[PDB]
C-alpha cells in the first residue's frame with residue numbers, strides 16, 4: 001500500500017469524524033479572549049481543528065507528521081490551560097486525544113512505509 005499521497009484524504013476523513021464527535025465542541029474554532037481573558041498569558045501558540053482543516057485544504061502540510069504535531073498542540077494547550085485534571089473541557093480533550101491517536105497510527109505507518117518503498121533503490 002505504497003501511495004505517498006494517500007495520507008491527505010485519510011486525514012480529511014479523520015477530521016470529519018472528529019467534527020461529528022460531541023467531545024470536539026470546545027476545539028472546533030480558536031479560543032475567544034473575551035471569555036478567557038488570560039488565555040494568551042498561558043498559551044503561546046493557539047490551535048484548533050478548523051485551523052488544522054484549513055492548513056490541510058490549503059496544501060500547507062507536507063506530511064501527516066506535521067498535521068499530527070498541530071493536533072497534539074490542541075490537547076497540550078487544553079492540559080496547560082485547565083485549572084483541574086477533573087475539568088469538563090480537559091476531560092473531553094482526553095477522550096478525543098485517545099480517539100485521534102487510535103485512528104492516526106495507521107495513517108503515519110502507511111505514509112512512512114510508502115516513503116521507504118520510494119527510496120528502496
Ligand SMILES: O=C(NC[C@H]1CCCO1)N1CCN(C(=O)c2cccs2)CC1
Pocket residue numbers: 025026027028029030031032035036077078079081082083087089090
Ligand atoms: O473557548 C474555548 N473554545 C472555543 C469555544 C467556542 C464554542 C465552544 O468552544 N475553549 C476551549 C479550550 N479551552 C480549554 O481547553 C479549557 C477550558 C477549561 C479547562 S481547559 C478554553 C475554552
